[PDB]
Design a protein around this ligand. Structure first.
Ligand SMILES: [Mg+2]
Ligand SMILES: [Mg+2]
Ligand SMILES: [Mg+2]
Ligand SMILES: [Mg+2]
Lengths: 412, 412
């Protein structure tokens, strides 16, 4: 027809693997008890770098679903996604053999895919020669393989792609899945993000950009909005969500955890590695999410800020939040706990926003003790506020001028 | 409301930089005269590789829009996109200062971004040390930067992202832009793809996978559907299209070249580096495009095949085409000319499909002389057929099980 009927999109389950937990309970446990996951880099000899802290996953449940041989097949970035997606499926009680697999899609966002494999194989190539590049290199490295792997693991035949917008990647991944089910192209979506770039190269890259915090004290390294913030801390991990059409969830009596109601996407089109100091594009991004969500500024009870713990970020971000929502709405950045997961940021912060609602609890911004003079946003720190959160948003601002905002509605 | 009104999406201009031309006329000139762009690799010392041919751009119009300093800012993969997008804008007479820049978005797909910069900087890191990684490394390398750069260059404030599905990347990029304008989220879109992976590493990677043709004769290296095909040839370049809502094009009296009417996206969810031997997912992908296009198999007058010139690809692809459309509809793979542009494949093959329509000409599949016994599709070779092409589709099948099909309608 000339028209397309809209559907409501709900979250029925989610999985996660991060520096602060490999299950929803552990994960949320860490947030509510203020237990951060930042510590000394153990993944490699950082003795020569300017950065010595990172949020690693040092207790990854490998045996649960994998066998040693799987390391010749997937890079950590893919392992994380697979695990997360499985947990999400187990959590959503989604029986994939009961699914209309053509309406079943997967979208796994990522900023740099298997950068570790790339680094390694590039050395092999230049040490031993072309004849020495492992055949499974590209299948492990290519940024889209996670999407395929997750799809291959659950027989999803629907829409399958990976989106890349740096730090905003998984926020855009969930948004596209949102729009997809909403306009009726798919019924179920496995969507989230994964990152595994705590490699010498990735760190060397961001350090050269001077974006990584050099603070030696793991507890003052990631302090979003704090006047002493000097860069973001690299984290690693993946977060997967299972989205379905309201109609589909009900038809199988699934347990709705929350609901996706808005998605804003804009581009600063200004600075190439930073967001507008005045959050010009971020503002519109928020307005767009709210517009789609048909709700107004006042109804927003919580904002999970990008809060990368960088001077420029928090300046622009607080600005835009105050411009649209105000100085009353609670603002916290959980990157203070998990570090910056980059392509996986959006996904994990969505789980934070969702659980926050399901617990009537606004998680704090760990480490933060003295907010910058100029930040007029109601930043939460020291400890977490208990509050009824009917509507909440989660922001992400990637390098390149990418802005993405997801709007959620607590389930009735 | 409960509903969303749909819009028609039209193409008003396109730009391109490839091994067979850096302008629409030159580009189409090469296709109609059977002039392929494959030749000996000149980008690096391939004396030690098993592959010696690639489709390079050796006459890239650098001075037209760039200054030497821009090489410290962008990797070739971004330069290509910028040039292509500019040509597309110049071609579409799109005055960006007349635009409602919030309804103006950019989506540049890519499979591996600035892999060249990554390779180089990874060596620097391990030669000289961390303190030696160039600060502009990530801004040049990250797969999403092209999207941002193109957005930054034309003030697009709308939707801005990069999609990654390997060989199907720019086909999915145009599809998302299609859906975006169609459901009224944007009015104008700068969308296409770019690839610049003719580097020692990229080649070493695919060669290890045994996906690259080892045929020394540049003219028999890329022979889609030919019984002697032994792998695909790596190409490089970018193709950008300017899409607008029918209503927007008319409102400024733009010149409509063609129209986007369908988009199918599915995942094989079978083999991790190849498409189903029976093209199970490819079929549905086509059916989906046709379904959205509200047209039937018979109305399709041309199919621009993925035709990667690999045994497995053409087998599954011909199968699916014959299963849905039949053995009558003309089938040609222009990768025989340009090589496989990967993330840029979709974009450039769309320009081929569009021009094909605007010229009532079905371009041939260069090099191909003896089609495989088992291929029952009406493959075009030896020379090009003249035919009225009212509706045509263009396919792409990336590693990971990604399938994407774009449907076009010749403009009335
Ligand atoms: Mg800091
Ligand atoms: Mg956030
Ligand atoms: Mg061949
Ligand atoms: Mg094609």
């Amino acid at each position: 027809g000339s028209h397309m009927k809209l559907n409501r999109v709900v979250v029925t389950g989610y999985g996660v693997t991060s520096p602060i937990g490999n299950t929803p309970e552990e994960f949320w446990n860490s947030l509510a008890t203020g237990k951060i996951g930042i510590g000394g880099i153990t993944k490699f000899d950082h003795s020569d770098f300017d950065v010595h802290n990172a949020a690693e996953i040092q207790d990854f449940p490998f045996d649960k679903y994998f066998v040693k041989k799987d390391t010749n097949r997937f890079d950590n970035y893919s392992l994380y996604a697979l695990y997360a997606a499985q947990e999400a499926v187990n959590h959503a009680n989604l029986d994939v053999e009961a699914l209309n697999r053509d309406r079943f899609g997967v979208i796994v966002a990522s900023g740099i895919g298997g950068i570790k494999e790339i680094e390694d194989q590039v050395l092999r190539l230049h040490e031993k020669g072309p004849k020495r590049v492992k055949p499974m290199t590209l299948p492990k490295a290519l940024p889209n393989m996670a999407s395929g792997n997750v799809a291959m693991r659950f027989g999803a035949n629907g829409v399958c792609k990976s989106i890349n917008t740096a730090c905003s990647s998984s926020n855009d991944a969930i948004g596209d899945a949102f729009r997809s089910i909403k306009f009726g192209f798919q019924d179920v979506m496995l969507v989230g993000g994964t990152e595994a770039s705590i490699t010498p190269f990735a760190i060397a890259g961001f350090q050269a950009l001077t974006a990584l915090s050099t603070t030696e004290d793991p507890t003052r390294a990631s302090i979003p909005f704090d006047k002493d913030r000097n860069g973001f801390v690299m984290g690693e991990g993946s977060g997967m969500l299972v989205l379905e059409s309201l109609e589909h969830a009900e038809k199988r009596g699934a347990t709705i955890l929350a609901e996706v109601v808005g998605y804003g996407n804009t581009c600063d089109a200004y600075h190439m590695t930073s967001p507008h100091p005045e959050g010009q594009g971020a503002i519109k991004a928020i307005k767009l999410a709210l517009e789609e969500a048909e709700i107004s500024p006042e109804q927003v009870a919580y904002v999970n800020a990008a809060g990368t713990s960088t001077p420029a970020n928090e300046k622009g971000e607080s600005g835009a939040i105050v411009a649209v929502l105000g100085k009353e709405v609670p603002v916290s950045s959980t990157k203070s706990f998990t570090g910056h997961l980059l392509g996986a940021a959006g996904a994990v912060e969505a789980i934070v926003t969702i659980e926050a609602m399901r617990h009537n609890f606004v998680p704090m911004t760990a480490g933060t003790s003295e907010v910058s003079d100029y930040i007029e946003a109601n930043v939460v720190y020291a400890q977490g506020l208990e509050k009824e959160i009917p509507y909440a948003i989660s922001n992400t601002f990637g390098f390149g001028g990418h802005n993405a905002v997801l709007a959620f509605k607590r389930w009735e």
